[PDB]
Amino acid sequence: NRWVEKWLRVYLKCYINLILFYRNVYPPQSFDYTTYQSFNLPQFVPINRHPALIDYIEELILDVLSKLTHVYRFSICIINKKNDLCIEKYVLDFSEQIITETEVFDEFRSSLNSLIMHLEKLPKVNDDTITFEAVINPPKIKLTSLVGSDVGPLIIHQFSEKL
């Protein structure tokens, strides 16, 4: 907690929405990438417009940040067939009196810009035949890390092991 909760919860909800669009768990043109901005960013922010599913992920990120205080290594795996290894492990490592609101709000841009740098630079294996599943701990896997959160109090290692 301690005032990083609001921007962390919107950061994970927008991170889930961007994963849902750019790795097409749902149909890609089943979104609205037009009228929503997450932070002060140029790029499209494609949230599913489904009210029951935005409430579903609303409760998902709200309950994982409810259990934030003793949360373990966070990840999201996209599964349709046997892979059995984590795809996108945005590891929420709990730190701890630093007053960082503006700087962390800027920091979630670069986390999400590392996300889109992983997203638009990403190949295409199969259309719509996949389903995500949030999980806390495709012939061959590949390792890729993204930016950290050193300006933020909590550090996020933001690993994304694709396939």
Binding site: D63, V64, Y72, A134, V135, I136, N137
Partner: peptide, 8 residues
């Protein structure tokens, strides 16, 4: 034990 199951 089981994890990410109640958070399934």
């Amino acid at each position: 034990g089981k994890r990410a199951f109640v958070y399934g």
